[model samples]
Target: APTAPSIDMYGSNNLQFSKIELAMETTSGYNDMVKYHELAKIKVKFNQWSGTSGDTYNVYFDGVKVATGAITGSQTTASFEYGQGGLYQMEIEACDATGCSKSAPVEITIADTDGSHLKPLTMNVDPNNKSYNTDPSIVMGTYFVEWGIYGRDYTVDNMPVDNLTHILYGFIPICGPNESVKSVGGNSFNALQTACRGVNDYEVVIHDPWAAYQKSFPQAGHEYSTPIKGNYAMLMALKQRNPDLKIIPSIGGWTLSDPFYDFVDKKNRDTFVASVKKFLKTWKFYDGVDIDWEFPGGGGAAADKGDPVNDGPAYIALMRELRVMLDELEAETGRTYELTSAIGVGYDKIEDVDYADAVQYMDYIFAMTYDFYGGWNNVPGHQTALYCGSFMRPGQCDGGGVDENGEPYKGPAYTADNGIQLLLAQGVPANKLVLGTAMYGRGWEGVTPDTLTDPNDPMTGTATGKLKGSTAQGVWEDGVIDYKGIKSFMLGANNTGINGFEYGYDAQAEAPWVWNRSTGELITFDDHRSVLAKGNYAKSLGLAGLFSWEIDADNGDILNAMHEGMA
Candidate 1:
């Protein structure tokens, strides 16, 4: 008996078909109907046939024989004209002197030859809903984290790239060579440094082989020939589908930035820049590099902070050098490249870096203006309030608790508006600024709300809560929950009503919160209302655009609001 014949219909040299067209509609998020055009002819191949000799192959389109081919060694192909446009079940049958075998059926679709037929596709964004954004010119960006595949089950294929202009690939770790921290055990931060072990090669290395390029995504064109697989391959397919979209590699994050402290100085800066140039050259898919050092000076992860005073100056110098090197590469390759930076929002952290000089070398500055308050402190407040209060320096706000020095711990009122204003004050151009929004919410448990004189405004009162830290509630980790989890566990129609959670909106600050009074749990996060407000604010101020920290955390509501608000 002949073995089942294997068929290759989607990959390179197998078959060619028009890709699906997703375009924005005036009122809705995207056009409700997806259209596909037909190809003149498609050649389908059957490879690796076994247990058959003198086999003649028959190509079946939706159970009807359309073409035939004689086996050529281990492979054979049948070419046929796509005369009509509709859904199809494609298959192949191999017949030999001994017996016959049929390959598994594979569905294939051919739309109108002139491209007029439409396939129903549910719009991720609701047009009648207030969060539908229509603008396309602004720099709408999002971070696609690598670790999301582990517990979050968020693969590259799940990413929504419709309105997004830039997708920043997160955490390409720098080589730490000769660091004392690698020997430390029992700490999570140290474990993240496994890639930077041993002698200083000073090269930028991919942290997760499986997530980065090992695993395959057939939907993302993994069936095609690629030097790499996994997320990197999917990103390339995304780029092919969206030509205007740019993918940039963001170096360093909270847990992976320890090496920047040692490498970005005058003495070792060249080594860092040299390796980065090599990285960009090797991964030609990248449009540019985004410097995401947690903070140039102090105020980063415990293991990642550099010199408080001098590191700022050192950062400026490193940027200058990197910019020059990128220009040289452009001259050699004849391709334009962008250089951007993600900066801390607090004034103290902002002041450490020379933004005035830094802006001259970089194309854009991303102000991460969230994390105002969280489980890190006993005081419960908005983590990303748009406009709750006035600005204050570190250790200046009276109720902010105490600082590391054990002094009156007045913390900076970190808000999106305040952070943008602070950057503007430093002479950073408005056009070169992009506002950051969080797709996940920070939470606190055991919260005790303070009595408010005006009972109508729950935000007016203070609250005390036990700091949850990174304890892991099985929700996106402890002290945090992605907006998707909120929709399922808190917002959805699980079985009963709203799941014992009371929804509240702070009109004054343009923020949203869900208080589970029974569980003494309070979660503050951005919703459609708040994200739309920020998008409108960013547009009104003529800022570059808006970006979400992690796109996977969103359930389309946040991104849609961002798009609609920007419009």
Candidate 2:
């Protein structure tokens, strides 16, 4: 039978299977085999037939026998179950009845199944709660709190946590931009540490201006300290306590905001960004930067020579550069830096800045919405309003009185919904904005029932009394007062006196004012009710959160109301 027709592995008589190559595929490489876990199966395919019957094949992983079987045919497939994750190797051998054998080996990698235990929960606002609005997208909520360093007089230990979120620290002075960094006497550092301790999610912002014009024009005055030192020190100290605390370097203020445009010019822009980055790296502090350019591109004592158009693209360019620098830094360091800006309440001034570009760079924007009605305006009206009504007359004193324009100039037309709308119209996202609340109030004199001719007129109104003294002697200075103070002074002060005046309340506006029959005393200030309304409005707008000028100025109850209302 010609040796039982010796098996010849060949497709054609002239062709022969000379070199036998072996290859295999597997799901994973490891094979410690834990338990019940499915292991990737392996497939064994041959390029050519060996032409041998009764061939025994074996599979081995890590040199251990996993499967043993006979290959009756040329093309064969086999698999083995694995339980754990580990490196695995598959080996296949072929043996005929003549004891001739060949083996091939392959390696594979197996990854362990991820076994994380914690579940991430999405943050959502409760709509049914009267304290908050129906919007669920709003994430930032504002609160008032004491911000002090560990050793400062206003350290966290001295703060009353009744209704505060984070503490504000005055780290820089107009004259000494780096005062907080060099002057170790103040409790700036200690206060920040103490306040941040255990406060994981709260914010600790450092209000540091560029030291008058020094920040805007470093060459203007040599007395100003470098802003980098102060910013770095504060950031480091606060981060030591709570890595999450927000450290912001406020750029300008009411008086020291003249050189904002000049400092952020193209010539000095890169230097500014480098300085900020160096400080961040050295101190390992701060999560973001706040541009407190009092009035971007305009609105200061005097404009800079290099000042760009109030509503030009330069302001937008500046913001874009800052954001781009931050992005590059984050990519290199694996950390994100936040950006924010302090916006003016004046609708015109706010309109000048490139708000759309600002929103792109800033994590949030704070509106200094107070002082709408103060002794300066010489009008009588609520400093902050939540709703529109008869009290919403034009030119009503933020403090309480009528302006020379004869219009009821209550502060600025940008107080309540108007201010919010302006920002929104400017393209600022609702989640990136915050409404401002004042901890103080404005007052005026000269009013009574006889002078109460116009319900909204501060001059025509009756004279309550000579506003105690100077026009600046607001309600806070007259005495520690709340909503009850207006009632007490009006009821017990005796309207029948020489400067007799009648007190009236605007039910729609939710503000109280006094009119003088002989003299005119029109005063307006923020009270618990007004503050609560402001907070509610913030919620309604779906803003990032709420902020107050100075926490210590409030009657404490207003802070509580803000907390309750925003909650």
Q: Pick the candidate with the highest TM-score.
A: 1
TM-scores for all candidates? 0.70, 0.53
Worst 10 residues of 1 by lDDT: 24-33
User: Candidate 2 at residue 292, lDDT?
Assistant: 60
For every candidate structure, what is the RMSD over all alpha carbons to the true structure, in angstroms?
11.8, 20.4
Candidate 2 local lDDT, 1-567, one digit each (tens): 001112222322211111111111111111110111234333444322535534566666677877777665665554344444334555556656566343445543332221011111111212211232323333322222222221111222222331333333333222112223223335443433432333221122223211111122212111222222122222233343443345444544543343345444465555555545543443234455555655665655343322436433655665777788789879977887776666776665666776876678667777777666555443455665554436444434232456445645434464556677777887778888777776555556544445444645553443333255421222434422233344345423342222354555555665545544454555565555676777777777777777766544433445555666676
Question: How big is the RMSD of model 2?
Answer: 20.4
| Candidate 1: segments with Cα more than 4 A from true spot | 1-136, 177-201, 221-227, 389-412, 449-474, 493-497
Tens-place lDDT per residue, model 1, 1-567, is 576778776542533343333222211111122223334356677775465544688878878988787877577766667656455677888888887778898766543321222222112332322424555667888899987877777776666666688899997867664233333333433433444444245557666555765575655444333334567656655665566778899987765566677754565788878878866765556888898887777677655456877878888887888899999989987988899988888867887877888889988888886777776765556778787542232444423656335666444456777778878888888989999888888876655344433444444344465324231322645677887667666666442226667777777677887776655577778888889889888988899998888887877778877887787
Whole-model alpha-carbon lDDT for candidate 2:
0.46
Q: Runs in model 2 with CA error above 4 Å?
A: 1-156, 159-168, 171-244, 301-312, 388-412, 447-452, 455-505, 510-522
